């Protein structure tokens, strides 16, 4: 088979998609648009045969009207987005007699070579700024920013000049999105508007993926800043009740040789909970060439909850305390495409085994509670001792003799009392080793805060 | 071009009168009414005057943005000086944002309102909240709703037409852009029958159609829409005031946008004077699953004397039977809406109403209106727009 395309738009099908292409395939396709112009490619969908060389199935794509080729492409990663130097593109798809999948669909379009702006950074140096600056930045204008160094070190960017407009609402005329890795779908650092100077950001990758968006009508000067490529490290600290992260590269396989790590705390008392869409690594009896360590609690002294690698997809893996740290490490020569990790943190049935003191709040805290909750903590105290209370904040919806939203206390089995309002509660002590905390929530809010409360022994 | 068949034309006249004639001195005033039998050429110059000293007299701080906007217009349309109230929605919609993209389309109806009474009073001095207002609206992105469509595009047509000469060419450019955006997603709603959106949206979207700059791609098939509201009205579908007022305008040839040019003592003429059953069961569930944790599922069955018995009494009869089934009311420009089942009401800060629906479907008139069949399952659900 194989065609040559002329269309400002078009699409482009593996043969046996929607499922599943034929082996020992030997392809191709030619793309050619208007001159002063640029390809853009999509990706919808692509399973391969997975190689680290990249021999057996494979797709490359040539940058036709230049000298090299943007690459070879096996397994399932795939940059979302590519973009030609030229207005020509080579498309060979090249396969072999066993094993097969659903192809791949992919879509392309026109784009102007005024129009656009894309520019990829390295030396650990800040020369990056908005369109025009400190002159306005124009209407209608996309631009987009990549920044990749080092394989050790973290990216740090830090703004001198911001001036964006401002938000109408919730709604966002101009803004600058931020992302983890190194592509449009990377985990989202951050999306940035109006007059205020955002953040010092920090990465978890040697790679950064940023997006300047501007409307139809009303400029400012934009933006100027700068970056330090400089520690050695990677992963983080992850500090949000839920989130997402990735492992470096992502989609594409990773670095080698490499040990990442991420601590999960948020919410005090209230244990994490992991999930991946997405999971592969060198399978291996017993387990240790490029491995997943999850912990549970904050640091590798903890009780070791797992140890992962190869292709399968694990089980969740509910951490059983309010910390949750996680180790990967992997050895010289192969690498897979790696994982993406939903995370979120639950408070379904947890339980204090052990602790001196600590604290409660309600998951988000201090932002305002999720609707619809049944909430179950229980603090253990030791051997023939007790626990004193104390709250620190309180603000729930009201009465209805605490029918709506409400918060329970419990000595062992018997009950304490049944809160809500704004009013916060007395200090106590419990009778018994046991402390049940129930929090219900209904399904609707004027987005009151949750509580927060110490504990003792 | 669509314009009623002098044929047809009684079957016009009829509403028209029998819309003036719910004015009374406890009737809720209903500014759409108003501007209705204003544009329309208003037979009843007892009515008009009474409901125009009605209006006048109502209090501000009652009067929502919407509301507020209808008023400005209504008054407008008597030749009446709004003036003070024209202020007060001015300093109210500098301060006007909306919630975010997610959130539901018809949110947008009653700003349209407001932008268009405000552009007709000013319209050099709308043009920020004209431009706040189009890229939020653009950018929202809830299942699109005709009825809001509808009047945004009058909001948005009457901007587009008055850009102060100097302006940079930028405005004219986004409000049409939305404008045309707008008018694809109310073709796309046109039904292989002459319907747009639905019989109670249809004639909101005429005069959004009769209005736009840029016509939509399939060519709207006017003649067929406006004889299928014809029948309809043969039909008896066009029995709620309100529902006259909103296509009384278009089949008189008339959009909201004419309004500034209404005249006053036309002196009208005198539309010529025109001269068993075994009560049913329905089944009546009534379910909470969202406020509280205290909610309900409980269902019940009930006798309606005849059918021509409207949902209404279903509900009383209910409350009667059993006072699980109690339930609170309240008045509006559409209607009696049912506010409250069984203590738990609507709450606008929750934006939570009561959705009656058929089993599974929901209904399209009020309570006051629909009549159920011999054995229909009507269920009303506590929930969220
Ligand atoms: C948004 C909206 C609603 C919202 C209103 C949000 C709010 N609280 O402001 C809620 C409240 C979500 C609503 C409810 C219903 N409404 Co509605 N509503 C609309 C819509 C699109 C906007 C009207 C508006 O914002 N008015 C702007 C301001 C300036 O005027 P207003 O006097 O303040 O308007 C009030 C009334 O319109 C009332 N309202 C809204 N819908 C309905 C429906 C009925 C039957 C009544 C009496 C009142 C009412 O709420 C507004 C604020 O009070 C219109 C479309 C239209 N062309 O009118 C319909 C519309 C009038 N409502 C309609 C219907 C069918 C319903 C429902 C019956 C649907 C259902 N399955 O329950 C329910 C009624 C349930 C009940 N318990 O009574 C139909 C007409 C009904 C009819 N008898 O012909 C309309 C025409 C939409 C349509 N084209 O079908 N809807
Ligand atoms: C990008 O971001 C930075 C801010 O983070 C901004 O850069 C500053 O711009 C301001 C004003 O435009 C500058 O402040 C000015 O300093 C003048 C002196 O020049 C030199 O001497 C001083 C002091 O030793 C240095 O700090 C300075 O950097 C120079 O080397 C002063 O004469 C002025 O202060 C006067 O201004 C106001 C009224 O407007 C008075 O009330 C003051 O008290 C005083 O009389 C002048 O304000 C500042 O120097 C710049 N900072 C930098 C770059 O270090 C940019 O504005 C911003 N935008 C762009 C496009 O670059
Ligand atoms: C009577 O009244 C109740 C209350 O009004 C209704 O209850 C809700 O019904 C909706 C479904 O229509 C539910 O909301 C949706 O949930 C979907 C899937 O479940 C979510 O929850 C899990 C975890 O708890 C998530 O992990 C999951 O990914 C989901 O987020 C979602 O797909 C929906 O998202 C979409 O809808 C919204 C608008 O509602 C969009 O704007 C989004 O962008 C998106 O496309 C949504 O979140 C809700 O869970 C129900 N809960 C309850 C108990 O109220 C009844 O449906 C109603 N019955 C009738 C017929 O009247
Ligand atoms: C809080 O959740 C826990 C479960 O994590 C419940 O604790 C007890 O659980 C045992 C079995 O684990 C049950 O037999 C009992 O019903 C529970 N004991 C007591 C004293 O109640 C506990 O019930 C939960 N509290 C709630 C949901 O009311
Ligand atoms: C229908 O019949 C019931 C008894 O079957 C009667 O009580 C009721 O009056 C009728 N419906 C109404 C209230 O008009
Ligand atoms: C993969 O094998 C090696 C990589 O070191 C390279 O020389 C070779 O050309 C690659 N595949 C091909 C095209 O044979
Ligand atoms: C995260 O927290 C630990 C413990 O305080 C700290 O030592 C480390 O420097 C932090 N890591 C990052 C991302 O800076
Ligand atoms: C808590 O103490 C240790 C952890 O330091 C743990 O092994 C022990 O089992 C716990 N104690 C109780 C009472 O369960
Ligand atoms: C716990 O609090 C009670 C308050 O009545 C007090 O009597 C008791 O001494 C406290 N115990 C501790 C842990 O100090
Ligand atoms: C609490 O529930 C509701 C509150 O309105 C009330 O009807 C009920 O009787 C109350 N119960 C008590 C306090 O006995
Ligand atoms: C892991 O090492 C090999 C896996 O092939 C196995 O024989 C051994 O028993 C396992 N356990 C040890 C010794 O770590
Ligand atoms: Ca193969
Ligand atoms: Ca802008
Ligand atoms: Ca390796
Ligand atoms: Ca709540």
Known sequence: ?457 | SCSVPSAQEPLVNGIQVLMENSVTSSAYPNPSILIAMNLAGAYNLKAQKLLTYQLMSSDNNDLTIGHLGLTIMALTSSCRDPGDKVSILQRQMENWAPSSPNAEASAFYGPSLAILALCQKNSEATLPIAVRFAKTLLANSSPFNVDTGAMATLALTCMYNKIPVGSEEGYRSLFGQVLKDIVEKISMKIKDNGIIGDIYSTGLAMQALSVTPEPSKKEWNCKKTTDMILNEIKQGKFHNPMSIAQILPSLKGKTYLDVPQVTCSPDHEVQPTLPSASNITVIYTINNQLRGVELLFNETINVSVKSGSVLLVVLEEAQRKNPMFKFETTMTSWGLVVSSINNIAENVNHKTYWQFLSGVTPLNEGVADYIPFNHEHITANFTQY
């Open chain 1, 1 to 457: 088979c194989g065609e040559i395309l002329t269309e400002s738009t078009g699409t482009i099908q593996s043969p046996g998609h929607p499922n599943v292409y034929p082996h020992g395939i030997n392809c191709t396709w030619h793309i050619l648009v208007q001159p002063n112009h640029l390809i853009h490619l999509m990706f919808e969908t692509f399973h391969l045969e997975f190689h680290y060389n990249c021999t057996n199935d494979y797709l490359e794509v040539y940058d036709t009207d230049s000298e090299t080729s943007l690459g070879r492409y096996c397994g399932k990663s795939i940059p979302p987005s590519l973009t030609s130097s030229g207005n020509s593109l080579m498309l060979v798809f090249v396969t072999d007699s066993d094993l097969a999948y659903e192809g791949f669909l992919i879509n392309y379009e026109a784009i102007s070579a005024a129009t656009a702006c894309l520019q990829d950074y390295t030396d650990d140096l800040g020369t990056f700024t908005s369109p025009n600056f400190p002159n306005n930045y124009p209407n209608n204008w996309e631009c987009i920013y990549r920044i990749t160094v080092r394989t050790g070190q973290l990216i740090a960017v830090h703004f001198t000049n911001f001036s964006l407009e401002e938000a109408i609402g919730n709604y966002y005329t101009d803004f600058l999105e931020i992302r983890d890795g190194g592509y449009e779908k990377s985990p989202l650092l951050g999306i940035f508007y109006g007059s205020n100077l955002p953040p010092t950001i920090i990465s978890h990758s040697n790679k950064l993926w940023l997006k300047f968006k501007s409307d139809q009508i009303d400029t400012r000067s934009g933006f100027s800043a700068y970056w330090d490529g400089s520690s050695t490290g990677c992963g983080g600290n992850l500090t949000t009740s839920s989130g997402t992260f990735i492992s470096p590269n992502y989609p594409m396989p990773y670095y080698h040789s490499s040990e990442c790590y991420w601590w999960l705390k948020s919410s005090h008392g209230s244990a994490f909970e992991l999930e991946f869409k997405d999971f592969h690594l060198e399978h291996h009896p017993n387990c240790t060439l490029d491995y997943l360590a999850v912990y549970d609690g904050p640091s590798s002294n903890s009780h070791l909850l797992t140890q992962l690698c190869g292709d399968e997809k694990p089980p969740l893996i509910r951490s059983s305390g309010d910390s949750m740290f996680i180790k990967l490490r992997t050895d010289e020569g192969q690498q897979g495409r790696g994982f993406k990790a939903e995370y979120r943190q639950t408070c379904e049935n947890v339980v204090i085994v052990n602790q001196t003191y600590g604290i409660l709040e309600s998951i988000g805290y201090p932002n305002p509670y999720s609707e619809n909750q049944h909430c179950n903590w229980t603090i253990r105290a030791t051997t023939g001792n007790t626990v004193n209370y104390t709250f620190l904040a309180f603000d729930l919806e009201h009465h209805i003799n605490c029918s709506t939203d409400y918060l329970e206390l419990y000595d062992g089995p018997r009950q304490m009392g049944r809160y809500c309002g704004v009013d916060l509660p007395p200090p106590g002590s419990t009778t018994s080793s046991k402390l049940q905390v129930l929090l219900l929530t209904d399904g609707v809010g004027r987005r009151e805060k949750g509580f927060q409360m110490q504990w003792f022994v």
